[PDB]
Amino acid sequence: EFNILLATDSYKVTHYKQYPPNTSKVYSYFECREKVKYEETVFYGLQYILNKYLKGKVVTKEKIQEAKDVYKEHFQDDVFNEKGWNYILEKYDGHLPIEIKAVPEGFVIPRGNVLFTVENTDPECYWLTNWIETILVQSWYPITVATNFREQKKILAKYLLETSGNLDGLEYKLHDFGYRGVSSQETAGIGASAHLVNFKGTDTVAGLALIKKYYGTKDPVPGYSVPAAEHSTITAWGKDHEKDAFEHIVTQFSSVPVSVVSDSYDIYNACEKIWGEDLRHLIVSRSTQAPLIIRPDSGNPLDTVLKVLEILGKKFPVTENSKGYKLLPPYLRVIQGDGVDINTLQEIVEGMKQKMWSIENIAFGSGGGLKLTRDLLNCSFKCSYVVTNGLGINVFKDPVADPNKRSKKGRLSLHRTPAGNFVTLEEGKGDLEEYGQDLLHTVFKNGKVTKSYSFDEIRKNAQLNIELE
Amino acid sequence: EFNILLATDSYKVTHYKQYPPNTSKVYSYFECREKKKYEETVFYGLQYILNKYLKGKVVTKEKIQEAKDVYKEHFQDDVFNEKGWNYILEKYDGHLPIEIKAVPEGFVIPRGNVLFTVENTDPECYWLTNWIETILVQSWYPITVATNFREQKKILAKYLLETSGNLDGLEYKLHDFGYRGVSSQETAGIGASAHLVNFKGTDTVAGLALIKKYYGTKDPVPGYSVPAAEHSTITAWGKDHEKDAFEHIVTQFSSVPVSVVSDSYDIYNACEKIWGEDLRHLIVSRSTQAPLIIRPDSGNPLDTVLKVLEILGKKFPVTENSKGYKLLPPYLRVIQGDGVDINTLQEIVEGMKQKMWSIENIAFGSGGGLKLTRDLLNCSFKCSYVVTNGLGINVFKDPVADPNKRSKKGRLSLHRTPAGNFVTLEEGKGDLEEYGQDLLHTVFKNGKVTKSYSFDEIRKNAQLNIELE
C-alpha cells in the first residue's frame, strides 16, 4: 500500500531540522515559469493526486513505523521526524493539515502565473508544506501532456478549417497510441487522461478508468477506438499472403471503421495494387460510417503520406471540396501514426495543403517514432512566504547566473486584468483589493478535497479559441 | 484493482478476429533493434512485470465482465473475445497459458539480439501472445534507464581511474534526484530501481521498496542518502541570512556528510565569502566521513563547476594526488545536480580533467535541468513464428522504406559465439546445436514465475569491464 511518508525526496526527511527555529508557516507555490512556443498551459491533473494520494487518513501507526525503519537503513542514522508524523496521526486522525488553492482544472493560463499554492494549517506542521512537494510537482506530467496535445490540436484545427471550411471530426484527428511507449501502467493512465482533455480517440484504455474514478463524464466513456490491424496480424499470414490478410480483416470488419497497417512489406504496392486494384471492390462498397483507414507506419512521415495520397488519388474517385482541396471518397481515409510529434504534425498538414489535399483525408496517431519533460514548461514548486517568530517574510531564490530561475515573493494571488487577462500578484498585494477577487480556489484543506471538476468542465475549459468560434 | 483484460492497446482486443484461421501458435520476441551510441543494453525489469502483473490468477468472472462493459462503450460495438478469456478462467483457473524465456536480468547484451520470447502454451490462446505485448514492451523503460546509467557510469569510471588511479567511491558518484521529474509514483519506483543497478546513492525511496519486494538484496537496503538542503530551507531564513542558514545546517549535521545548495542568491559569493571565509572554521574541522558537499544548481553546468572548484581551491588547502591532479581536502566536496545528462557529464569530467581537477572532487545528480524514450534503443516486440494448420511458418516485417525496421524470422535463440560474444539464431537454427546452450531461460510459464534473480545477481551481471579488471 502507498505510504506518503516514503513518497518524498529522501533529503526532505531532514528538512524539519533546517528551517529557522520557531517557523510556524511555510507557504509555497507552483508555476510553469516563464522563459514563442508553449506560451499558455493547460492546468490539469492535480485532482487525481489530491484524491489518490493526499486525501483522508494518509498516516497510520504502521506507516510511521515502516518509514522509521526504512529511513534508519537509508540514512544509516535516525533522522526521521517520528514525532511530527505522530502528531498528525494523534491530532488529526492522520489527515494532512494542509491547505491547497488552485486554478480550475482545464484552465488555460499563460506561463509565469501561480497555478496552485500550498501551506500548513497547523504551526507544528510547518515542515509538511515542502514534504509533499515531490508528489505535487509530478502534476508537471499531466499539465505538459494536456498542453502539448492542445497545441497539436491548434495546428490541426487551423489546417482542417482552412482546407475544409469547418472543424468536423477535429476531436478524432489525433489518436493516442502511446500505451507501450510510456514508462509504467500508472503513467499510461495519467498521460492518456491528459490526451483525452483534448481528443476522443484512444487505444490507451487506462485513461478511461482514471477519468471515470477521479473526474467523471456525462458519457459512459470519455474516449473511443475502432478495430485496427498491427503487423503481427498481417505478417502471420505469410509474406505471400498480405492480400489474403487484408481481405479477411476488411471482411471481418465490414460495417465498422477499420484501420489496416499497410507497410509490412511495401506500403506503395499495398496501396496501388492490393487496395487500389485487387481488393478495390471491397473498399468502394463500404459505408461512409465504415471507411477503410490505411495506415502507413514507416519511412519519412511527410513523404510517405503525400505519396500514399497520390497513389490513392489515382485509384479511387477523388472530389474537390468547396474550398478547392482534394478529397478521397468517404469510405477511404489515411492515418499516420509514425514519427508524429508537434513538429512533424505541422510539417505534414502544411505539406498536404501545398499539394491541395484536404486535412479531411488524414488523421494522426501519437506513439511510435518519437519525450516531454518537467523542464519543457519549467514546472516548479517554490517556497515564497514563511512565518518565523510570528513575523511573516517574503522569500525567494534569485540565482546570479540564471535570472530565469528567480521565484516569486510573498503571498500570491491570481487575478483578472482590466483587459481580461491573468496577472499574478506577489507580496500579498492581492489584499489591496485593486485587482478584484483571487481566481484560485481552495481545493484541499485538512485532509479533504474541497472543490473538484468533472472531466466535462475540464474539456470545456480547455477548448481552443477557434472552437469557441 | 488492476485488470489485465484492460491493460492492452485497444486495437488488440480485435486481433483474435484477424490472425489466419487455424492458427495454433503465435511466437513473438523482444529486442533492442540495431540502428544503421548505446551498443549494449542492460536487460532489466521484466521480473517486476511478471510478478506484479502477469502471474497467478489474473482472470476472474468480474474482470471479464468489467472488460466486456468497457469495450462495448469504447468500441461502440460488441467485439471482445469473451469466450477466449472464459476459456483461460475455466481451464487454467485464470492463469495465463504463456511461456516467456528471457536472458538473465542484469545481462549486458549487444543491440539486435533476442532478449525475451513469448508464446502461447495452449492452441486456443494463440491470441494471447500479442495481447500482452503492451505490458511487456514497457520493459523498455527499466532497460533504457539501467542502460543509460551504466553508460554514464562508464564515463565516470574512465575519468575517476585516470585522475585518481582507482575507482573508490564510483558507486556514489551519480545520485538519483529524479523523483519529482518523472511522470508518476510507479515510474519513480521502476526508474529508481534501474538506477540502483549501477549506483547506490538515491533520493528516490520508492526504488528501495520495489527492489525489496520483487528482487531482494542481502543488504537491508540497496540505496542510501545523506542530509541535504533545498532552496526552501536556505531561503526561508531571509535573503540577508544565508550565512545563518548555512551555519545552522552544517552544525545540525556536524557528524554526517551534508549537501548544501549554495546558489540561492550568488553561488560564487557563497563559496568564496560564506564557506570560504565566514564559516570556513566550521568546514575545516569536519571529519573525512562527514564532508560538506557544496551544491551549485544553476548556470552553465561545466562553467559553474570549474569556477566553483577554482574558488574553493584558493580558499582551502588543495593537494596534488599521485596522478598529478588537484584534490580538495577530504572534508570538502562538490555535487553538480543540474542539467546532468550523459552528454553534459562527459563535458564536465573532461573539462575538469583539462583543468587538472581530480574526479575525486565531484559527484553528480540526475534529474532536473534535462528524456529517454522507447526509440532510443529501438525496444520492439514482434511476431516471428506462427503455426497455422499444423505448419510452422517464419514470419516478419520488412518495410520497403526502412530496412532498420526489418524483424527476425522464425524461432529464436541466443548463444555465445566462439569468441565469447553474442549471436541470435533465427529460423530455429538453435536446434542444430552448433552454438552451445540457449542463453534464454524460461522465467514464466502458465501463470508461474519459474526463475527469479536477486538484485545482487543483477548488479553483478551488470558490472563494467573496468570494474571487473
Numbering used by the authors:
A (entry chain B): 8 to 42, 52 to 386, 389 to 487
B (entry chain A): 8 to 43, 53 to 386, 389 to 487
Task: Copy the relevant paper text.
NAMPT functions as a homo-dimeric enzyme that catalyzes the rate limiting step in the primary salvage pathway for NAD synthesis, the transfer of a phosphoribosyl residue from 5-phosphoribosyl-1-pyrophosphate (PRPP) to nicotinamide (NAM) to produce nicotinamide mononucleotide (NMN). Typical NAMPT inhibitors were found to occupy the portion of active site responsible for NAM binding and a tunnel-shaped cavity extending from the NAM binding site.
The crystal structures of NAMPT S165F/Y revealed a somewhat surprising conformational change in a small helical structural motif spans the sequence G383GGLLQ388. We designate this motif as “380GRS” to reflect its position in the primary sequence, and its glycine rich characteristic. As the structural consequences of S165F and S165Y are essentially identical, we focus on the S165F structure in the following discussion. A helical structure of 380GRS is crucial for PRPP binding, as it is situated in the PRPP binding site and the electric dipole moment developed in the helix can complement the negative charges associated with the PRPP 5′-phosphate group. The unwinding of the 380GRS in S165 mutants rendered the structure less compatible with the binding of PRPP. Structural analyses of S165 NAMPT mutant proteins establish the critical role of the 380GRS in NAMPT catalysis. Crystal structures revealed a previously underappreciated conformational flexibility in this secondary structure element that can be exploited by resistance mutations through an allosteric mechanism.
